[PDB]
Amino acid sequence: SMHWNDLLNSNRRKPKNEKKESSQDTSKGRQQIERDYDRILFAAPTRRLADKTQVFPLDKNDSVRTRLTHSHEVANLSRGIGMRLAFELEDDVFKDVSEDICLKRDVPALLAAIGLVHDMGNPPFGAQGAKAMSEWFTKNLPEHSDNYKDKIYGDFRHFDGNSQTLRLVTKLQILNDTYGLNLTYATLASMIKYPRSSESDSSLWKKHGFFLSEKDVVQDIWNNTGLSEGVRHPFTYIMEACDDIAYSVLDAEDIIKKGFASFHDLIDFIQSNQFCKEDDVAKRVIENCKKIHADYAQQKLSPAELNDMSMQMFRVYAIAELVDAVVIAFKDNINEFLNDTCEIKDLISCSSGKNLCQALKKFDSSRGYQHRSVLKLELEGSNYIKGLMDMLWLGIKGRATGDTQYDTPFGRYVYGRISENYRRIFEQENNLPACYKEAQLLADAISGMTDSYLIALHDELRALHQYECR
Amino acid sequence: SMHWNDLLNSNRRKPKNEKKESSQDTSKGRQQIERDYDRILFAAPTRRLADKTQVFPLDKNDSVRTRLTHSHEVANLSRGIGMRLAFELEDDVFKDVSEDICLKRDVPALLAAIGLVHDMGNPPFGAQGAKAMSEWFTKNLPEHSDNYKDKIYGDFRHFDGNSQTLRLVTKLQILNDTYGLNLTYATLASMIKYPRSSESDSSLWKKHGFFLSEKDVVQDIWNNTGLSEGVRHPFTYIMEACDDIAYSVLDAEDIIKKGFASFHDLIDFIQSNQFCKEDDVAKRVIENCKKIHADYAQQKLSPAELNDMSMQMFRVYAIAELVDAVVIAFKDNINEFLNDTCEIKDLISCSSGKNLCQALKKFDSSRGYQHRSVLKLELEGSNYIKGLMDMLWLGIKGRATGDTQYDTPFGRYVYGRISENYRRIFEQENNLPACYKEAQLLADAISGMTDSYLIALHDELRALHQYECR
Amino acid sequence: YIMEACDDIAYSVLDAEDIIKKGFASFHDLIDFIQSNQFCKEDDVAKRVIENCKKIHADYAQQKLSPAELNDMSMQMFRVYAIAELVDAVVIAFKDNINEFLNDTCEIKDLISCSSGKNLCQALKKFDSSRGYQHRSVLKLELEGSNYIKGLMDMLWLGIKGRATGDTQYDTPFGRYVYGRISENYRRIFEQENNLPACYKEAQLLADAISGMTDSYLIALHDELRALHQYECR
Ligand SMILES: Nc1nc2c(ncn2[C@H]2C[C@H](O)[C@@H](COP(=O)(O)OP(=O)(O)OP(=O)(O)O)O2)c(=O)[nH]1
Ligand SMILES: Nc1nc2c(ncn2[C@H]2C[C@H](O)[C@@H](COP(=O)(O)OP(=O)(O)OP(=O)(O)O)O2)c(=O)[nH]1
Ligand SMILES: Nc1nc2c(ncn2[C@H]2C[C@H](O)[C@@H](COP(=O)(O)OP(=O)(O)OP(=O)(O)O)O2)c(=O)[nH]1
Numbered sequence A, B: 001s002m003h004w005n006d007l008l009n010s011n012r013r014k015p016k017n018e019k020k021e022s023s024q025d026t027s028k029g030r031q032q033i034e035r036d037y038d039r040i041l042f043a044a045p046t047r048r049l050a051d052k053t054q055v056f057p058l059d060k061n062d063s064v065r066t067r068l069t070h071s072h073e074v075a076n077l078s079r080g081i082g083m084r085l086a087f088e089l090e091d092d093v094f095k096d097v098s099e100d101i102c103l104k105r106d107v108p109a110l111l112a113a114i115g116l117v118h119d120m121g122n123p124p125f126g127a128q129g130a131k132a133m134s135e136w137f138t139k140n141l142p143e144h145s146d147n148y149k150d151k152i153y154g155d156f157r158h159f160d161g162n163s164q165t166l167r168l169v170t171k172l173q174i175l176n177d178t179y180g181l182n183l184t185y186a187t188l189a190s191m192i193k194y195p196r197s198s199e200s201d202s203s204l205w206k207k208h209g210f211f212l213s214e215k216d217v218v219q220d221i222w223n224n225t226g227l228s229e230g231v232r233h234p235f236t237y238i239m240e241a242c243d244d245i246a247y248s249v250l251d252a253e254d255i256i257k258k259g260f261a262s263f264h265d266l267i268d269f270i271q272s273n274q275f276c277k278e279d280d281v282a283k284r285v286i287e288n289c290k291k292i293h294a295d296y297a298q299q300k301l302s303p304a305e306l307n308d309m310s311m312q313m314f315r316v317y318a319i320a321e322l323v324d325a326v327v328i329a330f331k332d333n334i335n336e337f338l339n340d341t342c343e344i345k346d347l348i349s350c351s352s353g354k355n356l357c358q359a360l361k362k363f364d365s366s367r368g369y370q371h372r373s374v375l376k377l378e379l380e381g382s383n384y385i386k387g388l389m390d391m392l393w394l395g396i397k398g399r400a401t402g403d404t405q406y407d408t409p410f411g412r413y414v415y416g417r418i419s420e421n422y423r424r425i426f427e428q429e430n431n432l433p434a435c436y437k438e439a440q441l442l443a444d445a446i447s448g449m450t451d452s453y454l455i456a457l458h459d460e461l462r463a464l465h466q467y468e469c470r
Numbered sequence C: 001y002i003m004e005a006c007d008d009i010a011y012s013v014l015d016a017e018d019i020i021k022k023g024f025a026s027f028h029d030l031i032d033f034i035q036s037n038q039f040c041k042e043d044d045v046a047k048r049v050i051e052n053c054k055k056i057h058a059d060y061a062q063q064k065l066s067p068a069e070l071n072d073m074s075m076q077m078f079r080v081y082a083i084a085e086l087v088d089a090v091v092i093a094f095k096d097n098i099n100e101f102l103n104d105t106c107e108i109k110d111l112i113s114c115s116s117g118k119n120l121c122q123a124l125k126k127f128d129s130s131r132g133y134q135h136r137s138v139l140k141l142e143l144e145g146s147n148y149i150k151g152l153m154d155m156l157w158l159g160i161k162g163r164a165t166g167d168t169q170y171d172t173p174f175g176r177y178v179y180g181r182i183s184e185n186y187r188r189i190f191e192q193e194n195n196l197p198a199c200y201k202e203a204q205l206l207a208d209a210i211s212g213m214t215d216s217y218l219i220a221l222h223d224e225l226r227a228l229h230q231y232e233c234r
């Protein structure tokens, strides 16, 4: 029902400049989606992703994954799946594609680009950052108050990383042209994890994928790609499956490396798992891991080195099996994915690696996400985020509504400390409600920060807030 | 006279195991060079590259480029050049290539893999780090002494990161099997930037590219790829050109971002440069930058934002021009590169972007490399490295020659602090001289450390060295 | 008028020089700002200053100098030429409008605006505001100084209010010590019997006390009184 020509649209939102000369051409024999990948890679938020943590602290020299490393791994897995689709399963998947589209250069580049940018706008301090901002907005934007009675403010009471990522990649650049990185329609369409807003009440997607401010942009993307509300781009399923596989496997690897568990602990957990006792993929992975572990034990290795090698081989085998299962599932259900009324929640659940991935997620939650150190760090990050949000709100509230409670010197300094692009977007005259604009400015300010930068700003403003507090 | 079939050899050094069932296959429809890129990406040193610095400190939240970001940018540029070669200039570049080789999947993957791993084995604290090591090896391995009189010890007196990178990817893995990551012959051949040893005296290459311990491995690579001593793989020129372009442009960008200079300063430096006054590439870049800077000045931006965006446009123009020039130069001189007696020093010199790259390097050296803060940090890193090397040599010296000066408790402790794989390699019975083995152990230990890890280890050992020092 | 014009010229030029020296901008940045300024594109004084600066900068670039040294020399020559041009313009304007200045109903706002160096001085002021006055470090220091001043003023007001009106809320030991810490001449003027309102006298005493302080002295006094204010606060 949905044609690949529209889904792989290489046009961009910004109108083409007719004054450009041949000397200003920058493509240099590159496909448009490859240019999108290059734009994402060379963006400042991509580099700042290194300073933002993923699960565990990033300053312990334990080679744990950060946002940048996780994004690169997801991009690599998506690129590999794209190579498989465009070089082996072209006939099965891309049945009707115009000759003007080079699948072998576009599909891998598109998958890599959407994988690399999938977690670009998430708040710092992991998922606890988004949770903390959601709690702060719920407390400071009460639903019973007439100013925030509207459901649109749910965009902040249930703050999502994906909506902020779309806003950042589309509107939050230095130039205020509502075009951002000016990615192709295919990349923007594939980037939308949840094609619905908080105003909508879709039961298929629990979260919302875009803010109220980006509603027109998302409508344009849907119009230029043949999609609609509630319908997810076919490559978004691949990107989500790759993200799930990557985080589930590499978080277990990081847990083993950090000493919170051991390779034998993971093997026993998978073997004793209720759904993994009879799963073929899990059985094959366990058999391969044990076979390699015997040979490794034959050699001379320290216990930590043996654990590391066994974990590495487990990662290799699990990633291979899960990627193969995901590719097979996508190939088998390609017609349903291309259907205009697709209702598949995720690609992994339709594959044979569902049980293994679910067991890995459970192991990561039980061993790593609920670890005492991780919980303490999450609480510290929540305190930092909430304190900084209160301090910034002291200098933001009333700036658009009309009240002058921000005119204190601390308020003016705090407002000046926010990045210039965010303030420029906030001061622009549009149809958004004033309270919505203030809350969006605060969310944009906090979301773009890294852990170290957020902590430093919080400490600095706490030092400068002493007089006003008393 | 060299053939692309040998240069793109996808075989690996490790003998292919015969007792492997189909259930243990992890290729999953991947080309071997793609698996090489995946192995490089998922390796622990690749993740640890984020903690290693390139020019400027990492703790500042200015989004300056680390070793990981620089390697990823180099890999992206090499991948783009490979896509251009395999999709547009296939007839001009690749002739008499076997149908078994899939150029469209191998060439971009090979270039990306060699770009990503090009700086995996460099010592921390930037280039000065390696320099510092050389100084230490010059003092503690005196040339006039009979023990260290042979030229092979020059391998440490002129320590270079490329030889250590080759050793890391070939031997310095946890599993001691002399195969390392088991990369393909094409990747290993393209990785060797300087195809000569310290003992060999060649006027073509300034530095050596491999240690004495890797002489047999390099000979095997040359035998299996058709190369020889002093002959460089054709893709190594592309990788080196991409590395030069990336560092020269992005170091200027980081200098401007850090505030050590401004966009107008760079424009004036390029315009007033003796060789860039009449250079076509430099003139075009300056014209495009000014044309876009006028339009950007039409809008309302802060001076910092204007500088940042103007230099962003400068980057997107200069990188495009330099990449196009490098591709054209490689296409034109392909016969000379394929010759068994190639003498070209670098690809950029043969290109038309030579003057712009030279001017950018001069600007980086004058403004960023010789800045006061960078010099102070380099001195601190040199002090840290030399102190740690002294403390480690206290526990390494005599471990192989036969002396017992290491038997002190501090010596045993610092020997135990070194990673187990390095000690396993050092204790293995081989033909290397004992002094060479000790020096190699120290070099492998120091090179594999990150900045923060090196500082922490130095401080800890200094704390523990108090009793024996007195 | 002459004093105000000299003050304007001095601060506008030397603040730009200090901005360049401190690294917040560069000589080429200032040259581009002046050249691209709307009112300085056709101003004769600005054109002459830019031409002289470029002519001297070429010769300086011929010599061997570090980038910081080249910036410093170019800034010094810009200061020399701009100061000369602005002073000459101010003198000419004062000489031409001397009768209006001596008029009993003079309505001239400033001497620079009547001179030919008006555009250059205005552009220099805009450059100083955009680069130096709104710099992040300057804003943070301004906020710190504001906090220090307001805290010290509250602490001193604790020991001043009511001293002349009649209320005895100052009789706490901290209030008496704070009053004793103020300079003797200010207190002697405040205690003098005159026709000023009591609240006006108290406010004037506080203003005289704070205004005569320096940065280091104000910070030290604020810290000392904060240390001595712990018991009264609780
Ligand atoms: N610190 C911490 N992180 C968690 C926890 N649970 C999940 N995470 C992390 C791991 C994953 O990156 C991610 C998993 O959450 P989701 O799968 O729901 O991600 P998202 O909603 O963005 O899209 P998705 O469901 O993957 O399609 O958050 C937890 O309990 N504690
Ligand atoms: N901190 C610091 N870094 C430098 C300095 N000079 C160069 N670098 C940076 C730039 C490069 O990424 C790298 C050295 O560049 P080179 O081209 O000279 O390296 P190499 O001799 O291996 O030749 P090649 O890269 O193959 O063209 O370190 C310096 O003086 N101080
Ligand atoms: N920290 C800071 N200082 C400023 C700023 N704007 C002006 N200044 C400084 C520079 C000058 O010394 C002086 C400029 O203010 P005025 O020209 O109004 O001085 P004033 O009113 O005393 O008399 P005048 O106008 O010169 O005749 O204050 C600012 O935005 N931040």
Ligand SMILES: [Mg+2]
Pocket (backbone or CB within 6 Å): A070, A118, A119, A243, A247
């Ligand atoms: Mg993710």
Ligand SMILES: [Mg+2]
Pocket (backbone or CB within 6 Å): B070, B074, B118, B119, B243, B247
């Ligand atoms: Mg490099």
Ligand SMILES: [Mg+2]
Pocket (backbone or CB within 6 Å): C007, C011
């Ligand atoms: Mg003055």
